[PDB]
Structure formats: C-alpha cells, structure tokens
C-alpha cells in the first residue's frame, strides 16, 4: 500500500512539525496588553488590523504581547481565547483622572472585569501607570478629588499616586493566587522592560513554588 505508506509518512512529519512548534511556543512569555483607549499602549509598545503582536526578547527571555484595542465588539465572546497567558499588562494613563464617565473609571471597570474574570483566576497583572509628569502638571492645575470624591490628601506626586495605586490594587479579588505589580512610567522611564522582566520571573518562580508544594 504505497498510498497508505505515504499517508503514514505525511502524518509522521505533520506530528513532528506540530510537536516542534509546540516546543517553540511553550518557551514564550504570553502577555495580554490592555487599556481603556489612550492609556499609553503606543508608548509602552514603542519603548519595548484586529490584533497586534509584539515579539521582543530581553535577557534571553521572550515576550509576546497581544493588544486587542482595535477589536471593538463584545469581549466575552473572545476573551477566553487568551486563557492561559503568562501575564496581563494593564495600562492606565494617570493624566486621565480628570478627563471625561472618567477614562480613569472606565480603565478601572475594564481592569476589574478582566482581573476577576473566570478565565483569568490564577494569572498575574503587571499594571502600568503612565504619564507621571503630566499627572503632576494636572494635579498642580486641578485637584485629584474630581476622579475620587472621597480624597483628602494633597496635590502632590506621593499621596496622589499612592492613592491611585491603592485604588487599582483594591479591585483585585483573587489575592490567593494572583498579585499586581504596579509601576509608574513616564516618557523617559527606561526601567519598564526591566520591571516587566522582574514581574514575569517572579510569577514563574511563584508558580514553581506552588507546583512543588512550597507556596
């Protein structure tokens, strides 16, 4: 049966190709980028049709980051397609606290939805908070109380940024198996890839600790 032998050879080579492709794709850090619009996705991509993939290597560690901003439709009908990504890089522009409800509140709602999501119960979120200098200018020109009415701190970097970070951390409900890595980013902060590398290594380490029963 020459035809059957050829079919068996074709199946064997197809299985080999599938296995090698799976091995290649297993050693890649899958990241899901987000943000409620002009939260700094372009800046984050530049410093590092329907879905955009950025494949970059740092310290011999590969990251493949997927942005679905151009995909405007019902999220729940495709969000599960990203179940199993290594981490979620949620981007929020600090300058959007006063802009209009608020873009900050829209970002908080999206963050809550994709954080407490049932396909993302045990995945970590690497939260970015962009435009710190613009945030400082905006808090000097107008108070933060517009975004958060129940606030009594001063219009300085420390208190305002700390309150924003705390508010974004409080949205997390899976404290048992996920943690948020908040960072503050400007147009000149070159430590963002270092921070994402640290977060990825930390989550991999915690996963190994859980697998061996030591976490």
């Amino acid at each position: 049966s020459a035809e059957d032998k050829a079919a068996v050879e074709r199946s064997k080579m197809i299985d080999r190709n599938l296995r090698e492709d799976g091995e290649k794709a297993a050693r890649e850090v899958k990241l899901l980028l987000l943000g409620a619009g002009e939260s700094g996705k372009n800046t984050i991509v530049k410093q590092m049709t329907g879905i955009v993939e950025t494949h970059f290597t740092f310290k011999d560690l590969h990251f493949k980051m997927f942005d679905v901003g151009a995909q405007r439709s019902e999220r729940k009908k495709w969000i599960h397609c990203f179940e199993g990504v290594t981490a979620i890089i949620f981007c929020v522009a600090l300058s959007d606290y006063d802009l209009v409800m608020n873009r900050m509140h829209a970002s908080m709602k999206l963050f809550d939805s994709i954080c407490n999501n049932k396909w993302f119960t045990d995945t970590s979120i690497i939260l970015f908070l962009n435009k710190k200098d613009l945030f400082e200018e905006k808090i000097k020109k107008s108070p933060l109380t517009i975004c958060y009415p129940e606030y009594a701190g001063s219009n300085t970097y420390e208190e305002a940024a700390a309150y924003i970070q705390c508010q974004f951390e409080d949205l997390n409900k899976r404290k048992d198996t996920k943690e948020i890595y908040t960072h503050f980013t400007c147009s000149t902060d070159t430590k963002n890839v270092q921070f994402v590398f640290d977060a990825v290594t930390d989550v991999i380490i915690k996963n190994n600790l859980k697998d061996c029963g030591l976490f």
Partner: protein, 331 residues
C-alpha cells in the same frame, strides 16, 4: 413605524399557529435509542479546538486550533492530510469548500483567510485575504470556489467574491455580533444568528433580510439547516435549542432539559433530520429527536467544553471537537 408594523407580525405568529407541534407529532412511535460509540479519535492539536467542518466526501475534515494551526484529517484512516500554519493564531472559525479544493479560516484578526488545496507542489498558500470586517470573523461558509458568506463580530454578514476580494454584498440588521451561519441546501438563502437573540434569513441574490425570528432568549451560538430546506435549528447560551420554519414563520419545537444548564456551541441535523445533535459546555453532545423533543443518548464527554460538531451529509458519522484538542467520531 417599525414598532407598529411588528404588531401585525406578532399577532400572526399566534393566529397562524393557534396550536403546538407536540399535539400533531404525538401520534408516531419513537425511534429506537442509539448508543453511539467513539469509532475514531483524532489527536495532534495542542490547544483548544474552536471549529471543524466535514468535507462533502464524508471522509476529510478540517479543524482550527488556537495554537495557530488548521489541520486537515482523513477520519476513515485517522491519518493527517494537511497542517496549515496561520498568520494569526487567534482563529475561532473554519470552513470546508463543498468542492473540497478550498478551506476558510478566521478569527480575532478580522480577516477571512482562504487556503487553496489543489496545489501541485504539496503545500498551502493563501489564495485571498478578506479584511473588510471590523470585528472578529465568527463564522464562514463557502457557496462555491468563487463566493463565500462570512459573519463577523461587527454585527455584519458579508457575501464576498474571492477573485474580486471585496464584499459583493453586505448583510446588516443584526444588533449584536453575528456568531452563527448556515446555508440553505439550494444556497438561494441562508440563515444567521447573532448575540441579539435573533436569527435572520437573508436572500443571497438580493442581499435583503427576507425573514427574522426572535425565538431565543440569549446569544445564539450555533445554527443549522434542516434537510428539507424549509426549516432550521438554532442553539444559544440559554441552554435551549429551537426549530423555526421558513414557510410557517414560527418556532415549531423547543429542545431543553433539566440536566442542561450550560450553553450550546454547535448544532447539526441527521440525514433524515429526525435526530438533532447539539454539543454543550458540559463536555457532552446530546442527540435529540426533531419530531418528539426527547433525547436519544448522550455522547461520552471530552476533557473540556465541546466547541464544535458536524454530522456528515450522508449521516454516516458525527464528529465532535472540544477545547481539549481531541476530535471524536461517533457512529
């Protein structure tokens, strides 16, 4: 206006029926219960399976996986025949040409990719790219090697000409994202379900919504055409399935049970149309009866949600593909 005009249609919905299909169909003997066995099992994919489509030869079948692969099998001998890599690994639909010379796919990239199969050199190259949709390509169905009908997440279906590469016709009217698409046997019309709990019957030649049915109460996920051609079946996330009639313009039968609380991912019909098979989020594929609304067996579950199924045109087999990267054949 439109809301007032819908009143007479709603009144006719109950005036033309004034009864239920169970009374008419309660005079026939139920067919013997069938215990389908997993004849073949297809392995080779590494991620969740999102779609499959039987070939018209009843033997080959294509399958789309989130790993970035579109595999083509030969279910009679279980051996692989093709494995097409993808530009985007976020594929959520696939289709087989009735001629078998083409295979479609698509997903979050908002572009329906057509792959030719009558290549002498033995590999696969994209014959055409159709990126006129602004949403994820939920479904696609070939009419021939020249024209296709896709349905995307931008609340729009589209009749594409492959050679032209542009939308020959655009079907608008769905409020939500269109998730399902079935073709009439004569291909003069087709029916498409969306997330607004509505299934619309569109004429391909004129590109106008000839009929509309609002039976479902949740997002429709699957749809199929009855072999007669004057009826179709629809399955949604409301843990129920419905049958609608083209000529009667009314929902005939509702398939539901207390042991089903999850959504329906795929539906299909048998050779005679007597049995309706539907795959659910609870790992199972249930075989119903189109004339009695009673189950005729539950297929042994996969390890994950069964995302697609397909009954062969000759009714000789039933394939089910699930999110565990396995394709089970039942006969």
């Amino acid at each position: 206006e439109a809301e007032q005009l819908k009143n007479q249609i709603r009144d006719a919905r109950k005036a033309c029926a004034d009864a239920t299909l169970s009374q008419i169909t309660n005079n026939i003997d139920p067919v013997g219960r069938i215990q389908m066995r997993t004849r073949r099992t297809l392995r080779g994919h590494l991620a969740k399976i999102y779609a499959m489509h039987w070939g018209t030869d009843s033997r080959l079948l294509v399958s789309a996986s989130q790993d970035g692969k579109l595999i083509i099998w030969d279910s009679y001998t279980t051996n692989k025949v093709h494995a097409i890599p993808l530009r985007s690994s976020w594929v959520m639909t696939c289709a087989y040409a009735p001629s078998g010379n083409y295979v479609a796919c698509g997903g979050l990239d908002n572009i329906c990719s057509i792959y030719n199969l009558k290549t002498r050199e033995g590999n696969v190259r994209v014959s055409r790219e159709l990126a006129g949709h602004t949403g994820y390509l939920s479904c696609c169905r070939f009419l021939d090697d020249n024209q296709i009908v896709t349905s995307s997440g931008d609340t729009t279906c589209a009749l594409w000409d492959i050679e032209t590469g542009q939308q020959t016709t655009t079907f608008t009217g769905h409020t939500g994202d269109v998730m399902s698409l079935s073709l009439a046997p004569d291909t003069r019309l087709f029916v498409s379900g969306a997330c607004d709990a509505s299934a619309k019957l569109w004429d391909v030649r004129e590109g106008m919504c000839r009929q509309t049915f609002t039976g479902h109460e949740s997002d429709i996920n699957a749809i199929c055409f009855f072999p007669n051609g004057n009826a179709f079946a629809t399955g949604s996330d409301d843990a129920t399935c419905r049958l609608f009639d083209l000529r009667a313009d009314q929902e005939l039968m509702t398939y539901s049970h207390d042991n089903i609380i999850c959504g329906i991912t795929s539906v299909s019909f048998s050779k005679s149309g007597r049995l309706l098979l539907a795959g659910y989020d609870d790992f199972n594929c249930n075989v119903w009866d189109a004339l009695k609304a009673d189950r005729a067996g539950v297929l042994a579950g996969h390890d994950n949600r069964v995302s697609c199924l397909g009954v062969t045109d000759d009714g000789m087999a039933v394939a089910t593909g699930s999110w565990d990267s396995f394709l089970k054949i039942w006969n």
